[PDB]
Amino acid sequence: MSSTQKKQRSAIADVVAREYTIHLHKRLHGVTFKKRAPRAIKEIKKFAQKAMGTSDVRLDPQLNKKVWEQGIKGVPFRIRVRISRRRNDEEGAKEKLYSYVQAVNVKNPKGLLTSVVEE
Amino acid sequence: VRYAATEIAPTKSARARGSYLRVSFKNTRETAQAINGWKLQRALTFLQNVIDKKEAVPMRRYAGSTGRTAQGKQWGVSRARWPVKSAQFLIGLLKNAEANADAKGLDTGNLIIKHIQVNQAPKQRRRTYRAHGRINPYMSNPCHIELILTEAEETVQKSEAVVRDVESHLSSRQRGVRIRRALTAA
Amino acid sequence: DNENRDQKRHMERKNANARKKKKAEDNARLRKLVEEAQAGDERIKRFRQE
Amino acid sequence: VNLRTQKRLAASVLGCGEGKVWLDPNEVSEISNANSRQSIRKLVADGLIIKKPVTMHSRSRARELNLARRIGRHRGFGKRKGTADARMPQQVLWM
RNA sequence: GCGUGAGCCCGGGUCGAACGGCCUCUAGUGCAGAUCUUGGUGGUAGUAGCAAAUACUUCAAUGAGAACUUGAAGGACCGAAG
RNA sequence: AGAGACCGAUAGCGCACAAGUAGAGUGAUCGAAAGAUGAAAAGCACUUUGAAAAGAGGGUUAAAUAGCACGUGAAAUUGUU
């Protein structure tokens, strides 16, 4: 009976952003060389969908730069990204929320845990 | 023009049709046979979800050498498919029928798919190049679709045939037995 | 007096796209105010720390 | 919008190919009503249409290998594929 | 309903301008076949299949609807007997 | 120019129609398919649904069980009850 109350709390808490590290090497093991880069984007989309339950994910062209920077066969083993959930203002929309993912630039992605970004 | 039922009065129902539609006849027939006698809102939700690939329409007559799926077990069949293009065409007629029902003033809360029909259509001509300089036909099978929506009452709990039954032509010996039993019992 | 239904629909096209974009912009402004109020309001800041 | 005509006209005016013409995406609607080259030269003179630079191709490694060849560094027995007569004929040595 | 039979007559529905009985005359006069002629339609069947020439991806715009429309930004090929 | 115990649109000349036309072959030459709404277009004003095409109402007519896929509409084959 408190599911609606939790969504109400979420009405205040819907805007949020976190930092995630996606281990793409463990998910691209064995796939065809001529399909690694196109498959990685779909895996990022499914990772964001599973992470935020939004069913509507929007990619950053800078993240496209970071994933296509070394050709199709060259994909980084690990990557660090920012996931932020924001509201959809267009009235003719199935579901009222969506996610917008973008690339956080760092020298290396090792040793860093997941954190909630606060402004 | 002239519908296939003709036992349904136009003033208490709604109807619609469309002809020369370029959709597969065998797939559209299975969709139509799937949605027959259902509630209008349930049919619209089910058919649109078919486009969303959450449930499948059972293939029963035109199902020769077709793959199997687990979503058809609820119909008790192992073969089912997802005819998106026919479902899209069906939405147009179901919405048109709803627009005619509201315009006519019927109560839109409780409708039933009373009648639904799919018919074949004249074919279209195309050619193919096979081998050794031969040419073979390349046809299409369009169709016509029509349906009628009526009200739902489903309330019958009385009949008089048993009371009506009576004994007119009786033999004399049996009538005598009936009278004797009437006296000895009352 | 319009040359039947077709003409009204032809103009309605332009009318519809204009109204939809305008409506979206109005929703944008309304939410932008809601957000300004949320940011300014101090009750939430004390509530989260507790 | 359909900007196929504009790239061909711009390439003709600029004297280059259509792979080097750059149109900014943020006023494509206003760019689309050009339909003439005199208008194209007005848009190129207004800074809305520019010509991209060429791709880098440098001979630094080639000339440093030439310098390293001038002092006999990469001319061993394993770097020649033709006969001594093919590389330096006797007829021209005697000539 | 009639006649052993080839066939004839009536009832109901649809349709719209000509048609029969009896005796003689006349013929391009009675079909299941001929790998018959022309036209139309099935099962096979929603099946065989749509596999040479290395390859696509993100955002935005138009639109009822966009892998194969357009712009920008990446990744590639043809590699001067192109 | 006048006639028939001749044929009646798979028949009668290859051609009852923009037929020696469309079309095939370098060429000599080969060579089709296709007639009928209603007495009169009086060929559906307008309303509504729909992106459109279309549908439902509502109209003309003795009839739209005659709607430019139009007289009558059989069988092979197919759909619903």
Ligand SMILES: [Mg+2]
């Ligand atoms: Mg393997």
Ligand SMILES: [Mg+2]
């Ligand atoms: Mg079988």
Ligand SMILES: [Mg+2]
């Ligand atoms: Mg089998």
Ligand SMILES: [Mg+2]
């Ligand atoms: Mg198979």
Ligand SMILES: [Mg+2]
């Ligand atoms: Mg072929």
Ligand SMILES: [Mg+2]
């Ligand atoms: Mg050939």
Ligand SMILES: [Mg+2]
């Ligand atoms: Mg066929």
Ligand SMILES: [Mg+2]
């Ligand atoms: Mg030489």
Ligand SMILES: [Mg+2]
């Ligand atoms: Mg010599």
Ligand SMILES: [Mg+2]
């Ligand atoms: Mg007549």
Ligand SMILES: [Mg+2]
């Ligand atoms: Mg004969």
Ligand SMILES: [Mg+2]
């Ligand atoms: Mg026969």
Ligand SMILES: [Mg+2]
């Ligand atoms: Mg015989």
Ligand SMILES: [Mg+2]
């Ligand atoms: Mg034959």
Ligand SMILES: [Mg+2]
């Ligand atoms: Mg197959």
Ligand SMILES: [Mg+2]
């Ligand atoms: Mg093949």
